[model samples]
Target chain A: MLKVIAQDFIKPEAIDIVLPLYRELVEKTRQEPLCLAYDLFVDQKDPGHFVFIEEWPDRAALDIHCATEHFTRLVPLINAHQRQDGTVVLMDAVP
Target chain B: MLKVIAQDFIKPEAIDIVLPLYRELVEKTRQEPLCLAYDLFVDQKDPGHFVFIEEWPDRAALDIHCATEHFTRLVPLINAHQRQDGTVVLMDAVP
Candidate 1:
């Protein structure tokens, strides 16, 4: 499986407005067949910092996920509220 | 709950050596009652990079986690193999 960690910063005051986007995204992503886990995190010490953690069983699901409408809907809204660009990367757990 | 993301760099060649340490840590941490998740990830693009993602229900569990014998024993070994001091911080998720 691939672990994807996407950490982003949003305008501090816009958190309430963005939660629904993430909330729905989390819900929808978890329903995907290949999803093992899908959740969001907020930095306790930094109001603007947030992260989305996901575990996907494979690449095909991930590709479909990125192209899905919910993803398309949220990226721009998320970008609109951004304090800065964030980091998103995938990882491996070597045996 | 609180989320912790610790990103660090290690000697690429020493990965095999550290895997067992991390493996044991994960097994032990997962057994803790407050541990919602405890997993390790390796940067596929950067062989030297690693990340530990953890979810603890409260500070009390975290405090105990940091005080465990395994925790004490692994710190120096982990630090010794490090390319740099990694980022370790706690996070929250606002309802």
Candidate 2:
């Protein structure tokens, strides 16, 4: 599976706004058949930092996810409060 | 469970030296009973960037893993050629 670690460094005050959208996004995304795993996380060391730890079958599956309505809509809304542009890292298991 | 994303931004030339140690580290770490998940990944976008994506039962379990022989010895060797001190983010899955 392809692994994704998408980091969002949001403004602390904007968390209240961003969290609800994240809940909605995670809820919907997990329902997709190709979304092997889709979960949200909050960094223990950085309160404003949130992460989307995702798993997909391949790049095609990830692209399908990115093109979905919830992603296009909710992600941008969530990004609006970012301290800076987020980092998205794509990787594969070493074994 | 607690999740850990331990990033290593190694000097490009050091990758060959680091890979073997990483292989050994991952091989041993996965044997720990408390280690729910332990996998390594190299960034698709950036060469020399490596990540350890792990899951443990809790902080105590994580501490046990850290104190193990493999981790204490291998990690420092891997970190030696780092571009900067790598970021290790501890997180909780959002529910």
Candidate 3:
């Protein structure tokens, strides 16, 4: 399985704009068959800091996820409010 | 549930030293009764970057986890090799 730990550091003022979009993505992405896990979280200390913990069967599934409507439409909108460039790490589980 | 995403950025030269300590942590942390999920992963692009994705019942369970034998002993050893300060984020599931 592929596990992705992606972080978004949003501008504090933009929380109102990005959050609902994230929630929508969460709702829609969960419907995809290959998205085994699509969990969203905001830092307890900072609402502008968002973390996405996702699990997919493979790279292909993940690529498909990026191309999904919710991803393509919402990510660019979300990124526009970034305080810093977001970080995305793709990893394989360690035994 | 409480979700913790902790990252470690090791000095490139220290990968050999830190990898086993981390593997040991993974092994020991999984044994705790309140540990709902414990996973370890290394970055595909950078061997020195590691991420730990964890889930626990609540704050008490997590604070207890921090004081466990593996966490106390292993974390300091791991931090000594760090290239940069690690990032730890505590979060609640959005839904």
Q: Pick the lDDT winner.
A: 3
Segments in model 2 whose C-alpha atoms lie over 4 Å from true places: none
Q: RMSD for each model, in Å, please?
A: 2.1, 1.3, 1.5
lDDT of 3 by residue, B22-57 (tens): 999998999999999999998889888998999999
Worst 10 residues of 2 chain A by lDDT: A86-95
Q: How would you encode candidate 3's per-residue C-alpha lDDT over A2-95 as one tens digit per residue?
A: 9898889999999998889999999999999999998899889988889999999999999999999989999999999999999899997767
TM-score (C-alpha, index-matched) for candidate 1? 0.87
lDDT of 1 by residue, A1-95 (tens): 88899988999899889888888888877787778888888887887788888888877778988988888888788879998888987899745
Q: Tens digit of lDDT per residue, candidate 1, span B1-95?
A: 87898887888777777778877777887887778888888887887788888888888889988888877887667768887778886888645
Measured with C-alpha atoms, the lDDT of residue A73 in candidate 1 is 88
TM-score of 2: 0.94
* Positional deviation of residue B9's Cα in model 1 after best superposition, in angstroms: 1.3
| Candidate with more favorable, higher DockQ: 2 or 3 | 3
Ranking by TM-score: 2, 3, 1
Comparing 1 with 2 on lDDT, the higher-scoring candidate is 2
